[PDB]
CSV table of C-alpha atoms in Angstrom, one decimal:
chain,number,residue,atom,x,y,z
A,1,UNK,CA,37.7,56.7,58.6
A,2,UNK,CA,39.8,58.1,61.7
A,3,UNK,CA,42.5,55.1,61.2
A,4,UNK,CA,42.4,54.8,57.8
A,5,UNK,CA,43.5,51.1,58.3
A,6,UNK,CA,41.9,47.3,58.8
A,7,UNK,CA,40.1,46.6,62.2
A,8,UNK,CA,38.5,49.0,64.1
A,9,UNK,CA,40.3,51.1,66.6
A,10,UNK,CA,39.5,50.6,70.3
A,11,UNK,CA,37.6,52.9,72.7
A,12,UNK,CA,39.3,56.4,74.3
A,13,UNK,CA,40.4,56.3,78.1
A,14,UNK,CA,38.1,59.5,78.2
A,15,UNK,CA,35.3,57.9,76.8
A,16,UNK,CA,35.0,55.0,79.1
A,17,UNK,CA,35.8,56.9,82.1
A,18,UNK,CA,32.5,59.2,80.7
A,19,UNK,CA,30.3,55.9,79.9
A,20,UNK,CA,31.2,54.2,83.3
A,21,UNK,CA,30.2,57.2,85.0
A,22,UNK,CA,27.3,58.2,82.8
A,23,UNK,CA,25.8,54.3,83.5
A,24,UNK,CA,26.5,54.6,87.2
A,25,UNK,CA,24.6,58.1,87.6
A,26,UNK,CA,21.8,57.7,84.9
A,27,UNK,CA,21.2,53.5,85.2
A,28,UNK,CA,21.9,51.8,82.2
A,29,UNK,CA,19.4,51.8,78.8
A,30,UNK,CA,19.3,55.4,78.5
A,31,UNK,CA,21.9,56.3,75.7
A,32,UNK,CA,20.6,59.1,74.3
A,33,UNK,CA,20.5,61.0,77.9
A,34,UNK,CA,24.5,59.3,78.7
A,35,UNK,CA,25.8,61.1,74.9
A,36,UNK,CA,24.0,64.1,75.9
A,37,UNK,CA,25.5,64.3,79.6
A,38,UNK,CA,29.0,63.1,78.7
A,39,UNK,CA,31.0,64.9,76.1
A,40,UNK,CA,32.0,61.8,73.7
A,41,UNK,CA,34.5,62.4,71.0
A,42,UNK,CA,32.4,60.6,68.3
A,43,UNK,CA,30.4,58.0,69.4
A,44,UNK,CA,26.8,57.2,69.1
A,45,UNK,CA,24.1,55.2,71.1
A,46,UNK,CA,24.7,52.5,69.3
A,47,UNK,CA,28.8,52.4,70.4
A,48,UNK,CA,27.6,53.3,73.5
A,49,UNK,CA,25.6,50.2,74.1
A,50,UNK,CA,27.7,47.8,71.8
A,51,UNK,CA,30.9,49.3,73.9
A,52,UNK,CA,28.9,48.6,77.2
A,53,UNK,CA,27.6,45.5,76.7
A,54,UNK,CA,30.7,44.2,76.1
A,55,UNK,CA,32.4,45.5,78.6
A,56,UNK,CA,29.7,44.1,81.2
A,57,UNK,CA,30.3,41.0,79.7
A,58,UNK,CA,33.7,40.1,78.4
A,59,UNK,CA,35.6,42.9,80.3
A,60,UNK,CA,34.0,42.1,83.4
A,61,UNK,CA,33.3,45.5,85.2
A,62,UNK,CA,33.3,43.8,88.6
A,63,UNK,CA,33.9,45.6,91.8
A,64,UNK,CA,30.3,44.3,92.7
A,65,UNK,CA,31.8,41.2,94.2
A,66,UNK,CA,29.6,39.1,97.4
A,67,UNK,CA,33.2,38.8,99.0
């Protein structure tokens, strides 16, 4: 609704900033605690774990590099 327009809108700086941190001090698979936690601007567990697993995957997170 909050585009009114074709293809959905992409994620808020603030949000992801709140997910990355949410995952790195709760561990991952625990959505309900991370929305709780982390003031989202409408999200649910669901985008939270659609949003993360595709970040993980295709926007490779990294920084957790051998060398």
């Amino acid at each position: 609704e909050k585009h009114r327009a074709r293809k959905r809108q992409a994620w808020l700086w603030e949000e992801d900033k709140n997910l990355r941190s949410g995952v790195r001090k709760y561990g991952e698979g625990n959505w309900s605690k991370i929305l709780l936690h982390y003031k989202f601007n409408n999200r649910t567990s669901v985008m939270l774990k659609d949003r993360w697993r595709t970040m993980k995957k295709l926007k490779l997170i990294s920084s957790d590099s051998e060398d």
